[PDB]
């Protein structure tokens, strides 16, 4: 991979070849990206799995959740064409993107009463049925996650453009807990170490010891980061990684930060999160052993909409850990209000 | 780091920003690179260390060995200017680049009888002295490595151009065994995982399981690869890494290869090595349990200059492991001649 790359911070120019770790985590939602193989395979898979108690599908990536909104009419139409009483009802998504328990599985011998080419058009809509299949949505009460499908898709055919970007997906032959490794990134060049995917930009730097510096999340999946794409993954303690393993945190020493512990109960219920190390405007933090223990993260503004003046931390390290999102500014799990109870 | 990179194998084009892992391991010896700070500091350091039995310096990188060939006249001149009877005699280098036992150390208070600027010219040469300091060379008998200096330099001031490339070095404040981490590379993008430095291009790929595919060495240092720049460094067995830890092998699972063991006694005495997985022309390998055990690597051509027809391996995996260099073609440690004794 040859080319030339300019340096913004160093005010220099470089040229050469090798491995390029790329953007498209920020500045837009490019890489739309997902589209399956011949949908007859998926239709046969879902109609086969419906008989053993598969009641829903929980998305593993919000891009693939957006994918499902483009085949549900086609899937309903082909399901009706095969004289099986089953309808699919999709829905929206809000974090945290939960994790299912069961998964799709071949049966690679599909329903041979379907078409073969991609030229079928002039499709007609369907109606409601007594037996309905739900898709990722706010219906956690009717059917639990224990009876839904999760992580049953994988990229094949090298999955790229032209034109915008195009992965052609095949359903996973085996159950798995890790994320999809055919689109992942991890690199380090003498000052920074980034971990990248569709929605994660965990990046660390070195001032005096290697530690996390900033991260950005456009989604919060529940698939474990595979250990084959994590730098410096030895002797790592689960009680010190900033981003928990359950929320796709890389099991690495670059996830550490001195004076901090695991952020299990942070403001993860948001959909978009910025991980900087500053103060929220109008607020200050002071180190004090008299401050209370670490509890769930609290917004810097009350429900009525009033700011908080002072803050205290037990054994944190300046600058503090704060969050960002649509609703405003949050703080770390180890920081409590100075005197407010 | 924004820019655009073309794809040669994929016949596609990509653009974006992020982290770029670069070339300048091949196609020439760019990045010349090394040059120190004010040489008075090094002169004071060497004249101070000479009194405790420091008899030589063993280069940690061949680039820094080439560095020492540009200050030995200046170092001799400043040493003579300070009325200390000590002369420095440098030499050439041949692999394997050995490792010393002691190291330079401040004493940051230098000899204040020196100059301050970099404008001193019209220098005069010196003569021989009773007390001589040797530099990396073929003199392993007069003074052992146990009384030499090793790994006493580190990059500072961000160490880059303009123009060709320029690191400004400072001597290490503490002893260390690992290499210098301020110029290292490691990256992985969905098919390949490379580890890069001044002279190493260890690269792995994935066909069915992640395994080493090719590597190139322009030098063989003896500094341990630091674990903070190695991908997938968990549960690694020392008896299975292809490149040994002593010869700057990354402690990683990407260094593995099924059916192979550690190449402790390979053809490392060469200076340049290519690590492919083919046959040497005119030779063939067959798997046979009757073949002998693994012994030191043997050239495919005899001393007289005759090729070897057949080869056998005990528990290898096709294609075999072969080497390259100036002298010709070598083979792996686990492969022996079929019938030659």
Author numbering:
A (entry chain B), B (entry chain A): 1 to 341
Reproduce, without paraphrasing, sentences from the article in which this PDB structure was first reported.
NS1 is secreted alongside dengue virus particles during an infection. It is a multifunctional protein which exists in different oligomeric forms intracellularly and extracellularly, and they play distinctly different roles. The intracellular NS1 (iNS1), exists as a membrane associated dimeric form and is a part of the viral replication complex. The extracellular secreted NS1 (sNS1), exists in higher oligomeric forms. sNS1 likely causes vascular leakage symptoms in DHF/DSS via two pathways—indirectly, by stimulating the innate immune response through activation of complement and Toll-like receptors, and directly, by binding to endothelial cells causing endothelial hyperpermeability. sNS1 when bound directly to endothelial cells causes barrier dysfunction of the cell monolayer as demonstrated in an in vitro trans-endothelial electrical resistance (TEER) assay. Here we show by cryoEM that the recombinant sNS1 exists in multiple oligomeric states: the tetrameric (stable and loose conformation) and hexameric structures.
